[PDB]
Amino acid sequence: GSHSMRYFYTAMSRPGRGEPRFIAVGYVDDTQFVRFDSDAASPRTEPRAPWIEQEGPEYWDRNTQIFKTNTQTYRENLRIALRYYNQSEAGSHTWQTMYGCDVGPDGRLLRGHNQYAYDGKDYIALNEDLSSWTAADTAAQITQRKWEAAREAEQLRAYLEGLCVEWLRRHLENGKETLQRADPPKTHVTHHPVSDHEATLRCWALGFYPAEITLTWQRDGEDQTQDTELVETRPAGDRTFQKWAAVVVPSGEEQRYTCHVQHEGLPKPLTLRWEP
């Protein structure tokens, strides 16, 4: 039912406070399963989800080998970036990278991803054809010709089409009980009088997984986008997520308002209304 594995790398320089820190985390959809931190007492990749723990020591040491190598490569990227942007060695900078493969119900690659950002700004990204690059500026163009000359896209393509999807399929199998289980949101509408003429109707969605969800208020069948307050979906801490949408309505007219909830864990879109 469409899944993806993603790795997020962050490297940050800190002049006067040691070598640049490198942190890596891996996810399958909205479930983190691994982590690596160069700042840990004894840097080693650590499990963050139950199902991954059963992997053998070969997997874990290979992971640590890859991450230690990546740690040094990013320290070099930070040094190289100063040159590309004529920056001083006195400032702190950040390199971020995302890798990922999306797979369809049948397990075949829907698409691969590989993007870089320096100091929070898009730098270079592998195109969807997994064969070319898009550089954001003249420094990234340098990296592009450099990567084209070494045919980096081809090696990345192999990983994205091979190992990535193969391991994702394996993770989905081993973590089936959770990774392939959608938890529908528990929903209810609360009422909060704000004035004698107005009141707040808040539509809640709790304990749902995955994070993707749609909550909307309709006034007589019309969406109240511009007048709806929607908070960013937030993690509960138990793997599930939460979200709410609120609207201020004239006292007495609340029955003209309906809250609509769409989630993949629901047979069909829900419709709620305040029930006094």
Binding site: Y7, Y9, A24, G26, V34, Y59, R62, N63, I66, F67, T69, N70, T73, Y74, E76, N77, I80, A81, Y84, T97, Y99, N114, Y116, Y123, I124, T143, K146, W147, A150, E152, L156, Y159, L163, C164, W167
Partner: peptide
């Protein structure tokens, strides 16, 4: 397995 980033920018 995580992707190897052996090539610098």
């Amino acid at each position: 397995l995580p992707p190897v980033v052996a090539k610098e920018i």
